[PDB]
Subunit: 196 residues, 6 copies
Amino acid sequence: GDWSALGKLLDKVQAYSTAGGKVWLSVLFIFRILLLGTAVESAWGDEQSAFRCNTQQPGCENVCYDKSFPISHVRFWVLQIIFVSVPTLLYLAHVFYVMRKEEKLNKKRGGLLRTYIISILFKSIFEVAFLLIQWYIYGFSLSAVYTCKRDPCPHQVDCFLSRPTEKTIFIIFMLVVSLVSLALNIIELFYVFFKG
Amino acid sequence: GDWSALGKLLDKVQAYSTAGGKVWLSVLFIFRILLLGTAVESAWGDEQSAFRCNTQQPGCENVCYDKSFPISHVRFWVLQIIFVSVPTLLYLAHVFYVMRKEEKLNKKRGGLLRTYIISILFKSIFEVAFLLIQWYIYGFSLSAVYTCKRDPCPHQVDCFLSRPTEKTIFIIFMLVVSLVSLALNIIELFYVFFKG
Amino acid sequence: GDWSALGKLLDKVQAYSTAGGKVWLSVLFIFRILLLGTAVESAWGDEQSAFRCNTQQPGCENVCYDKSFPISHVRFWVLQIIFVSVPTLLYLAHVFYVMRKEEKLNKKRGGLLRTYIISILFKSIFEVAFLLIQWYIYGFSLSAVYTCKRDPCPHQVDCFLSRPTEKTIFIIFMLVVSLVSLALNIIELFYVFFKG
Amino acid sequence: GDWSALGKLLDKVQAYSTAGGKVWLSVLFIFRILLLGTAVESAWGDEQSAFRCNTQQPGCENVCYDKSFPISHVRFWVLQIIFVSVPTLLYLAHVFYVMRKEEKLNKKRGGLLRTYIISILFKSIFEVAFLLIQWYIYGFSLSAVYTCKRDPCPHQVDCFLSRPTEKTIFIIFMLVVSLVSLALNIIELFYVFFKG
Amino acid sequence: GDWSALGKLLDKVQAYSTAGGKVWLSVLFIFRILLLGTAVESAWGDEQSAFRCNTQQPGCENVCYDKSFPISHVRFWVLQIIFVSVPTLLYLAHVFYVMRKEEKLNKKRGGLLRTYIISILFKSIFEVAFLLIQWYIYGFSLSAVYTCKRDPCPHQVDCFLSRPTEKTIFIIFMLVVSLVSLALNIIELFYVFFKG
Amino acid sequence: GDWSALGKLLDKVQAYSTAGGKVWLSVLFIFRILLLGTAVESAWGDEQSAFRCNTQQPGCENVCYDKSFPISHVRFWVLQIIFVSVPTLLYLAHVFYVMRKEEKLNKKRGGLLRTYIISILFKSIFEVAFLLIQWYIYGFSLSAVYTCKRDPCPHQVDCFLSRPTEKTIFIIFMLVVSLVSLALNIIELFYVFFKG
Ligand SMILES: CCCCCCCCCCCCCC
Ligand SMILES: CCCCCCCCCCCCCC
Ligand SMILES: CCCCCCCCCCCCCC
Ligand SMILES: CCCCCCCCCCCCCC
Ligand SMILES: CCCCCCCCCCCCCC
Ligand SMILES: CCCCCCCCCCCCCC
Ligand SMILES: CCCCCCCCCCCCCC
Ligand SMILES: CCCCCCCCCCCCCC
Ligand SMILES: CCCCCCCCCCCCCC
Ligand SMILES: CCCCCCCCCCCCCC
Ligand SMILES: CCCCCCCCCCCCCC
Ligand SMILES: CCCCCCCCCCCCCC
Ligand SMILES: CCCCCCCCCCCCCC
Ligand SMILES: CCCCCCCCCCCCCC
Ligand SMILES: CCCCCCCCCCCCCC
Ligand SMILES: CCCCCCCCCCCCCC
Ligand SMILES: CCCCCCCCCCCCCC
Ligand SMILES: CCCCCCCCCCCCCC
Ligand SMILES: CCCCCCCCCCCCCC
Ligand SMILES: CCCCCCCCCCCCCC
Ligand SMILES: CCCCCCCCCCCCCC
Ligand SMILES: CCCCCCCCCCCCCC
Ligand SMILES: CCCCCCCCCCCCCC
Ligand SMILES: CCCCCCCCCCCCCC
Ligand SMILES: CCCCCCCCCCCCCC
Ligand SMILES: CCCCCCCCCCCCCC
Ligand SMILES: CCCCCCCCCCCCCC
Ligand SMILES: CCCCCCCCCCCCCC
Ligand SMILES: CCCCCCCCCCCCCC
Ligand SMILES: CCCCCCCCCCCCCC
Ligand SMILES: CCCCCCCCCCCCCC
Ligand SMILES: CCCCCCCCCCCCCC
Ligand SMILES: CCCCCCCCCCCCCC
Ligand SMILES: CCCCCCCCCCCCCC
Ligand SMILES: CCCCCCCCCCCCCC
Ligand SMILES: CCCCCCCCCCCCCC
Ligand SMILES: CCCCCCCCCCCCCC
Ligand SMILES: CCCCCCCCCCCCCC
Ligand SMILES: CCCCCCCCCCCCCC
Ligand SMILES: CCCCCCCCCCCCCC
Ligand SMILES: CCCCCCCCCCCCCC
Ligand SMILES: CCCCCCCCCCCCCC
Ligand SMILES: CCCCCCCCCCCCCC
Ligand SMILES: CCCCCCCCCCCCCC
Ligand SMILES: CCCCCCCCCCCCCC
């Protein structure tokens, strides 16, 4: 029965948003979690135990695997999803204490709106930042043969990845679902400015 | 005691459905989850660690396994089940905010119905889409010997899968339970049109 | 405090059953789950990683293991337990919406009974069906040496299973607890007919 | 607030027991679970993967491990603990429906007592039964060298177990805690008879 | 709202304790659990799979590992923490039924205090008992080389442990946090006697 | 509905803090947990199973791995996060019993403030202590080749770590998020003194 006070909190947090963003993005947050922790986490399980290279030099598979994967895509997308969720969480924690301050006033314009704008800016700005890093480093694909030239391997060794194509499809899903997230925040950002 | 408000929400979401779909499909959603995450998830555990090929060429088992399995059936069926559930979830989130908008009206035809129709269309349309992809790629069976002709293997190598018959039976269950899902949405789709 | 409405639902679902079936079968459902997911699931963990055969032919252990186990007993008994539980779940979901239809009637014989009979028939009929399949395929024991004659092995190879005796005892428990389930539904089936 | 009805159910189930059994056995049930599923389950993890024998005969470690362990002690003690708990659970489910039958009587001697006696008999009788089986099979110790004479091994092979002493200490705890359970039910059994 | 009855139970259990023990020991119970099941449980994961010895004698690593570790420190500290918690749990279960007996008296000195004294004695007495056993067996350190002289190894073999220094630091934490537990119960024990 | 009493407890614990620390640090506690147990725990999974050294000397990989990692970074950061959380937990448990003492007074300055100051001091003081230890031992990086000179290896051996660069990035995140924690407690510490 104590959900009646929670109804006031979920109303005031989304009083400035449209009728289409709170139904599409909230499902998109549930979608991105359920894709990440259930389907694709088990896919990157043997990212190192199957990585075989064509040499006898001991440790050459240790230093060549790292050059291909400075940071794996799974711990990348977990690093991304907290950074896109944290401006919403920070706005949620602030609006709760603001509501509590006003409940202890009545029994004995523009202040809330600025941080609501900033909360959607850093949602996109971190999202563009994590995309171009992936283009700068990994691209949006995976080749089935890597040629490695680090030390202490000899001249050039051939290292064969573990499931390039299965890792390819879940990369493009993480590109598309992030890109439809990015456009879905931009359309809110026009609506808050064009109101006046 | 706060389930009385939830009783109004579960009534309005299924006010257009028949008396037979909400009892058969809701159990079919519980059935498909319980078959997937409990029985058949452990069956595809060693999909790569048992895949042995008949060669000495290093990495030939890495590139030949991929040609047989571009995407494994388990991460396929998890990818399918979210896409069939998401039009129901999207209709659920929309009808909640529509109900909340009308609760803040009375204390101080055709609008809901169109998206209810669209919500059942994309349930079937994604379901037909995922079936024919499996026929285009994997078929509905698994052979116990795969002949591989990728690079850098030699001329032709023999690769032996891991449990073809146990993977065969759970494929046909995922075909049958998806097909009885597909017919169970079609029978609703006639009933909403033939009402008038 | 909202368990008072749940008290009406658990009364009407078992208004036709005896005083002895709802206390013995409900514990038997808790018993079969707790035996399956806690004790015997870990026993069939290394069903493939310990299966060794007496040959050098690569992949001969892959194709010979399958002939011994087309479907493992653990994923068999999980497949069985959902099929015996689903007619009870389907009767539970139907009787809830029937109760809700009558609650929206009073504020502004024989119909329920037929599907209650059918719900106990398919509990036994699926149970007899899964038993004879095991007799047709696996029997009710496990021998400690399997002789395999599939391809591409040579003439005949000896393959040694993993824990035949520990798998033997839990098979007989799954035979006995299923058989005492089968007789406990039959005794209900006489009581509903002999009432008149 | 709906724990007030649960207070009547936990009173009537233990109206015939002493003030010392419901405080000592209920903690003993919590003790035996917490010892089993947390401490000693991880100890029997590598019961097969460390079992090495002194031969080259392939599969000789498969058939010799079984003769030493027809059923492992962990799946034995899980099999024991359900059988000692099931007469208490069966008495709990029966006394609930008996209470419900009398609640639907008042708004519009000796019957309960017999099954309470039987419920404590089968607690001890199954407990004595599982103890002597262990004495008939395993004893109450483990030797660090097993001599195996099964087929298809040669004349006699030496097989070395995995952690005999760590498995020895948890056997004696499972003997002592079962024996203090057995005496704690007997002392109740005198008290119910000597009341008259 | 039914926490008001729980407020009476948590008051009467600690009516004889000081204002400093219920705030320091209750956090110390939360600390010792969170250190044990989260940090140091994963540290002792490969206690056997990394234990390598310097011989070819088959099974010599099985019988030499046991002499170094008759019982591992993790299953020791889990065995300790239940024994220090069980006198508090036994006093909690007794004081609940004592409270229930007096609630069924008013609607139609020295008795509680003795078992409160005994409950703190066996907390320390078991704690001193488990400490000196560790000094009698393991000491409070771990050496990086063990020399083994059991059978059927030859004259003397060198066995190298798995992470001695990481296991050293968590031993001293389990010594310090147990010792600050032991002094924190003694200071209560003076306060109950010196009251009179 | 019993969250109304919890509203008084969460008000009195933070009556001396600013409006910016309770919204930024509480999210920072949720951030550091979610980074630790989800993203970086799986990264340090094979910290030993991939550590290969360039020798044939048995056990040389056991004693050389330890010199590189006396305590792994994951069990370090878990050891850190409990020590920074424990002064907040201790202040939470104390303020609850202080509130309960005053509730049993009214139905029949400076005392709280001192321990609030001490609770923030030991948050920073333990945080500076764990940082400089890492600088004294590990630094803030990881090199891809370790040269080992322990016994019983020969003169000098080369040991290659497992993923130095992926472990490098999560170290700097654990430095930055700890450092922004350290400055966020200092800014509170000025505010409590400069109030008067
Ligand atoms: C009385 C009607 C108001 C009840 C509001 C409850 C909805 C808020 C919960 C939304 C989050 C649920 C996550 C599953
Ligand atoms: C690798 C396992 C992934 C499991 C899910 C990851 C959850 C991390 C994001 C949680 C954000 C919650 C914000 C409210
Ligand atoms: C060794 C060659 C250079 C490697 C640089 C890797 C940079 C990866 C940066 C990832 C940043 C993700 C968190 C913002
Ligand atoms: C009075 C202070 C309120 C702070 C509310 C949070 C504002 C948005 C913070 C966004 C941080 C973006 C970088 C991670
Ligand atoms: C009345 C609303 C209760 C549920 C709110 C849950 C989120 C509150 C913000 C989370 C951080 C607050 C610090 C405890
Ligand atoms: C009204 C409250 C204003 C809050 C200001 C916060 C602005 C963002 C500061 C942090 C940006 C850089 C974070 C890495
Ligand atoms: C030294 C070359 C490293 C190249 C990758 C650097 C990644 C740094 C990420 C910083 C993120 C800044 C977001 C505004
Ligand atoms: C007062 C009667 C109305 C109560 C309605 C409760 C039923 C709605 C819950 C259905 C989902 C339950 C999932 C297990
Ligand atoms: C591979 C493990 C499978 C576990 C179950 C998968 C659940 C994913 C579907 C959840 C959809 C929920 C919609 C309400
Ligand atoms: C390498 C030969 C071509 C492989 C193509 C594989 C296509 C798999 C498509 C799966 C799509 C599932 C998500 C819609
Ligand atoms: C006002 C907007 C309401 C939106 C409700 C959801 C409609 C159905 C969306 C189905 C999406 C199908 C493609 C995944
Ligand atoms: C009153 C109903 C509460 C339970 C509803 C749970 C589903 C609501 C839709 C889920 C998304 C809403 C965004 C928080
Ligand atoms: C009344 C609300 C209408 C909603 C329109 C949504 C139609 C579907 C658009 C997305 C289809 C393509 C998704 C891949
Ligand atoms: C390049 C050849 C790839 C063949 C498989 C392509 C699969 C694409 C799936 C698109 C789904 C569209 C659903 C309407
Ligand atoms: C060569 C032997 C192949 C065996 C295939 C067995 C197929 C069984 C399908 C079971 C489906 C049952 C539908 C209810
Ligand atoms: C007021 C008395 C009626 C309360 C009925 C509660 C019993 C129904 C629950 C039975 C299932 C419990 C599973 C653990
Ligand atoms: C292999 C792990 C087994 C875990 C338990 C299996 C549960 C499946 C049966 C659940 C049926 C629930 C019907 C109400
Ligand atoms: C390859 C030789 C024939 C194998 C047939 C295996 C049939 C197994 C049928 C199991 C059916 C279980 C689901 C009904
Ligand atoms: C009006 C329709 C009610 C349906 C209730 C369920 C009847 C029993 C179905 C049993 C199915 C057995 C085959 C799995
Ligand atoms: C009032 C009873 C609430 C609990 C009932 C739980 C089972 C209801 C049937 C489950 C399927 C209903 C579809 C949501
Ligand atoms: C009164 C409701 C009657 C329901 C009829 C259902 C009978 C069973 C039909 C399905 C049997 C075959 C399932 C494989
Ligand atoms: C082709 C030979 C296969 C032999 C096993 C067939 C099993 C089919 C199971 C069908 C179940 C029907 C239950 C009524
Ligand atoms: C109003 C006082 C009666 C409340 C009775 C609650 C005690 C019954 C619960 C005992 C089992 C608890 C298991 C943790
Ligand atoms: C091997 C893992 C053991 C986990 C605990 C086993 C629990 C089985 C006994 C449960 C009996 C519950 C009776 C109420
Ligand atoms: C192969 C030599 C005879 C082996 C007999 C093993 C008997 C084990 C009986 C265990 C019974 C436990 C359940 C009652
Ligand atoms: C009217 C029937 C009541 C049955 C209550 C249970 C009696 C005790 C059964 C004990 C079974 C012991 C063998 C497992
Ligand atoms: C009013 C008491 C509710 C809680 C009782 C939980 C145990 C009831 C017996 C369990 C089997 C009953 C079949 C649903
Ligand atoms: C008053 C109820 C009497 C119940 C009789 C049950 C006696 C035990 C019968 C089963 C004993 C054999 C089980 C293996
Ligand atoms: C064939 C020799 C087997 C020896 C072990 C038999 C164990 C049978 C257990 C039966 C339990 C009976 C309890 C009353
Ligand atoms: C009305 C005020 C009394 C409420 C008492 C609640 C505190 C007792 C719970 C202490 C244990 C909590 C463990 C997290
Ligand atoms: C090895 C995993 C350790 C997990 C925590 C162990 C908990 C055992 C102690 C629980 C005592 C509870 C007393 C109330
Ligand atoms: C084989 C040499 C003697 C080994 C004796 C080991 C004794 C360990 C006793 C541990 C007792 C812990 C529970 C009280
Ligand atoms: C009337 C009996 C009350 C018993 C309460 C518990 C007393 C303390 C028992 C401590 C046992 C210490 C040895 C484990
Ligand atoms: C009214 C208090 C309910 C919660 C008490 C939980 C502990 C009670 C003692 C635990 C053993 C009691 C046997 C069921
Ligand atoms: C007032 C209740 C007295 C309880 C007496 C219990 C004393 C301890 C007896 C057990 C000590 C030995 C346990 C191993
Ligand atoms: C036979 C030599 C064994 C040496 C270790 C014995 C440990 C026994 C522990 C008994 C604990 C007694 C506590 C009072
Ligand atoms: C090598 C062994 C070193 C042991 C040092 C620990 C001695 C006890 C220190 C903790 C005392 C705390 C008293 C409050
Ligand atoms: C009636 C309004 C007061 C309700 C206070 C609830 C907020 C306190 C909970 C904060 C912690 C939530 C963690 C998710
Ligand atoms: C290695 C797995 C990490 C899992 C999370 C660790 C949690 C430990 C910190 C919990 C502190 C809670 C304070 C309230
Ligand atoms: C073997 C060379 C000296 C190794 C010393 C390692 C010291 C590590 C100290 C870590 C302390 C962390 C807990 C405070
Ligand atoms: C009356 C005693 C109150 C104690 C409250 C806790 C004070 C802060 C303790 C901080 C301990 C720091 C070292 C871990
Ligand atoms: C009324 C507040 C109940 C919830 C408080 C939870 C934290 C209380 C302090 C935790 C230690 C108290 C010892 C049981
Ligand atoms: C007002 C309460 C004062 C509490 C004093 C606690 C001061 C800190 C003592 C412990 C410091 C050393 C811990 C390792
Ligand atoms: C013997 C050399 C060891 C060097 C590391 C010592 C670490 C000790 C940590 C003590 C922490 C004290 C915090 C105030
Ligand atoms: C030799 C290449 C080393 C690459 C080091 C990359 C360091 C990246 C640090 C990212 C920290 C971002 C802070 C927000």
